[PDB]
Amino acid sequence: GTSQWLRKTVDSAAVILFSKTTCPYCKKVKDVLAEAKIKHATIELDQLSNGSAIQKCLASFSKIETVPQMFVRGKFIGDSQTVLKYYSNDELAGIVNESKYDYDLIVIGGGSGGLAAGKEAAKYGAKTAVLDYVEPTPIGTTWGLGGTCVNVGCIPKKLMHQAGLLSHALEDAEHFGWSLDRSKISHNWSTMVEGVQSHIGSLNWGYKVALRDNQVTYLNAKGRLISPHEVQITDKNQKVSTITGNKIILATGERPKYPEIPGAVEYGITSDDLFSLPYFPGKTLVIGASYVALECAGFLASLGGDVTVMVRSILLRGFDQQMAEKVGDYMENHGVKFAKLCVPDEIKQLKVVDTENNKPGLLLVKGHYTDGKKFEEEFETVIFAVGREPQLSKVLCETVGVKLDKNGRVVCTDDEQTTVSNVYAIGDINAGKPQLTPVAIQAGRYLARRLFAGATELTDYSNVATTVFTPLEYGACGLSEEDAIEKYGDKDIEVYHSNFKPLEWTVAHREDNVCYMKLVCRKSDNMRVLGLHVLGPNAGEITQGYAVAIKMGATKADFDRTIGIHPTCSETFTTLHVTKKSGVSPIV
Amino acid sequence: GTSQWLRKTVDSAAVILFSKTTCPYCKKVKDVLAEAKIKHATIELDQLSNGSAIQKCLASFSKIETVPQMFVRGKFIGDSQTVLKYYSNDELAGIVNESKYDYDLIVIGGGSGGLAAGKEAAKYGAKTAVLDYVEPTPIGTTWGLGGTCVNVGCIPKKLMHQAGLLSHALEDAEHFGWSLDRSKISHNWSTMVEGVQSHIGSLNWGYKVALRDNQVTYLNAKGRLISPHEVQITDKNQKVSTITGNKIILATGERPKYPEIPGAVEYGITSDDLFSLPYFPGKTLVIGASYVALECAGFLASLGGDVTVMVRSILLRGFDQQMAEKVGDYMENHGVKFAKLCVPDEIKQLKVVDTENNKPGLLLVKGHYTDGKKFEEEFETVIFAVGREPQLSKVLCETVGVKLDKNGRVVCTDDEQTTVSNVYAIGDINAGKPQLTPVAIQAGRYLARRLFAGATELTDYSNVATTVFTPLEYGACGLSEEDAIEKYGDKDIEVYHSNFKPLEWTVAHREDNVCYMKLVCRKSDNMRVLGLHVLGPNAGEITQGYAVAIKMGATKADFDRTIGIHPTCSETFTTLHVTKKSGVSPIV
């Protein structure tokens, strides 16, 4: 019953006050703790819907059933007079700071989930340490605090995506009446990297400050869990030492893989390097077909580069494959070339990168197709986006006993708990969860509230919406069409779909029938919406609101009875009617 | 119950077949009707939850209980042998064209709702006429088929808005690395208007083609209803004649109002003239405070014009007022001048418009502030945006019986029926309804299904989302905050809000804390979202999807459990936490 909740909370919380709102004796303790700069969690029992039962089990720890009761790391401290006695005797500081370990929580990894978990834990009185270290790339690139998204991920690529998009606005401008001469317009790579890097730098520093003003200790060190409560750390000056913590959170994420071919590590780069590269890549070869590969090929072509993408098999594996093909067809018609069904064999250096003059090198790529024929072409730059992976042998001593799945990711319960009872993992290294930054932040926030504040909310990991930021963006929430058919049978699946054309595209003389959307619906369940898909401008802003409706179990009927906002792209979802089974064309 | 439905359906349907999806006799009649180009509604009894009692109740009209049964305008026509016999003998075409009236449906008004009702009715075999005539403005402006939105509303105004937004792309371009000199670039009004008008012309054409292909009769004539079934039509040649119909749908919309001051009609213009003006307005005074006024002042400013808005009292009366003031503040910080608490007293002409050199005139405007001080200034163009009104005197003879509310709008039941049992009204003139194109369209399609296909679905007019396309856009769904407090009391209303900054605005050096959103919730009803508000870019794309969740009863918890898409603006709705009562700052 309620009893096992209360004991979990009391054993885990660092400082926690069971209080009531209309209690002037409770206010006296809150104010004293606030003046002493003592942060704590608070459980207002008159607001929880079974506070009476809780007030009874409290007596199992404190032998009293009144309010307030203050606890520190599992130990009952006093009622109002006892804490007030400690305070006027100068004994309150040394009691709240009494712990078996150096910290209440050590977070290994200062990325999206790590930093989120750390700040949230500190709010409730947990002495917290956050460790972060950025191991350099093969050519030596390195960056500041924040993790992959901040430094070499979502933030720089979308800013470069946006620089690409601005090229369309210079194309459109004559049709809308602006007199600029588009043919004498060049883009400057290094100017744009400076502005992107400058915003990035403002985020590293913002994070360092945030940690400081939350009383979190930031340690720029490499962590290693040598035992369930012991984390070993290495300085930037090689200096080694050991710190201890009650709870450990692992949040060290992933890094880009390289194919095992001669020349790859020596002569190629990855996305870790692309966002601070000091020279324009030049004629580029992007090898791979994930969203990283397609997004990066996309904005290089838009900034005027000569870009080729080498695809082993298909585009965007695991995504709706009608949509992936539409995405890829847009790119192929708007200046991205593809070497389909082709694979690399080696990279040969012909020219070394010129640091002085700020120029790329020259490379020779040898590959072959699946018919056997040979690929041979020279490129100034070669980017590998062939997947990402964790390296938990650098982080996690095998003797500690954290169970890893077959890819190297951490097996966790639905509350992020590992096979060692005090160790948890969040974000990209949590086996089988969506690898996305908002997921890592919600995971790490919600988990901090459970350990140190007595919350019960779990992170919900299903139907998390995504957006691929290719030249024509692709937004999705829910099942792909092939997955929905394979799960319920083709007779049980109805798909409503339609092309559309942004009103902005009419005067600009753009394509009529490339933008596309569809709803995938289960017949036998009130036409429930299993998955939404849209290819068009601003696809993230379009998709996001519908993720709420879908989390609430939206049906086709719900979409019909809601009225559109006009003129928008997104309103076309409110009047879909052509089914795929009908065979009627979806064009405009 | 069921009995009354079946008799309403049989009485107003034009041609209707009762059928079942398995019956191969019914398939025989469908094929004859198809081959004869006979359009008809079809009800498939085995797909309806009470097809048994319906099939029995059919015998009250036909004296048989079997399927298929074919009816024409209330009269039972036969089973399969009788239909086949009529076809075989050349009698079927005459039977199905038998009517007491010229038309099953006459639509007075060819705009958003009118066109939508007509096309839908035609699909089920209703012989349909739509009338549309555009009374010219005071200076002579006139336009083609489609209504106010297509020709002088949502379509031209968003295109002009979009031209204005393009100016920020060219400001933003230098910071993302593109070379162009923003200073040597200028805008050509007439080039822009040619592109807008070209798209509008292709909409005028598309609609005449759609009516032709649906066998709808289109008469470019002004309609007056003289009796319940008699519509008097007047030619572009002034020829008068009378046509009759079973059902009448009034869908005549509204036109701009003018203040009763000297010189307003002679020398001012309205939005009806703005979108096709052959010269650039020049220095402009917009008189009004509605969305029309603010959206037009907005794009005129972004296109380099010298723009002043003259406001009697407040901005955007009827919208959440905190949101309205953030809208006006933004416009004022970006080049729109405001003359506050001011009203105009007369317009004097200093220059006649120059048709020759294609230039505007010159005008002197006199007015006064609410404290008596005088207003006096020169402008080249004065645009009145002081409301809109219907002119049902020109459509509706007194003696017919159609009740009007005190505004001239038509009083209708929740199924759009007027005080005259066969006359209906949809769109802007339907009293008490949100005056929006998606609304007018949905009402027209749903009503046509009920008249001629046996449908029961009503149009749901509650919580229709909206977007105001000012320089910084404002999307909304549900109640204003002040309305929500007036209705439930302050203690029962919680408001979560935050500022935000688009990632696109970081490198562009745009403002940190100007974009804003809030959720207005009800504490006693599970923290139900009563109103959603967002000021920022793509606010209509942002808001639309959430309208579906609001319709389904979404709470604050529903927003919390959904994960955001990153990086987006709209993802801010998924982690809102600062409340207004807490007094914490909403900046970031």
Ligand SMILES: Cc1cc2nc3c(=O)[nH]c(=O)nc-3n(C[C@H](O)[C@H](O)[C@H](O)COP(=O)(O)OP(=O)(O)OC[C@H]3O[C@@H](n4cnc5c(N)ncnc54)[C@H](O)[C@@H]3O)c2cc1C
């Ligand atoms: C090119 C690219 C684009 C992306 N775009 C998007 C997007 O648009 N939207 C989206 O939602 N997601 C996007 N992602 C994914 C997103 O970046 C990740 O899901 C997210 O960053 C994972 O966060 P995390 O907290 O799990 O780990 P990370 O953010 O990777 O942070 C882990 C941190 O811990 C550090 N660390 C590692 N080992 C140690 C150690 N032993 N000691 C100390 N510190 C250590 C790492 O160096 C790093 O700083 C993108 C990823 C890439 C590569």
Ligand SMILES: Cc1cc2nc3c(=O)[nH]c(=O)nc-3n(C[C@H](O)[C@H](O)[C@H](O)COP(=O)(O)OP(=O)(O)OC[C@H]3O[C@@H](n4cnc5c(N)ncnc54)[C@H](O)[C@@H]3O)c2cc1C
């Ligand atoms: C400047 C402006 C901007 C707008 N922007 C938006 C927007 O962004 N989004 C939105 O949802 N709404 C917008 N609206 C509102 C939208 O235009 C109306 O809600 C919509 O047109 C209502 O459609 P309706 O069918 O009721 O009327 P209308 O579209 O006005 O159609 C009525 C038609 O009937 C004709 N008619 C009138 N009298 C007769 C007669 N006696 N005989 C025959 N024909 C006749 C009229 O000339 C007209 O063609 C805007 C309106 C304006 C003025």
Ligand SMILES: Oc1ccc(CNCc2cccs2)cc1
């Ligand atoms: O809602 C909107 C709809 C279209 C646009 C302009 N289109 C930009 C693009 C051109 C090519 C790919 S994306 C802006 C907002």
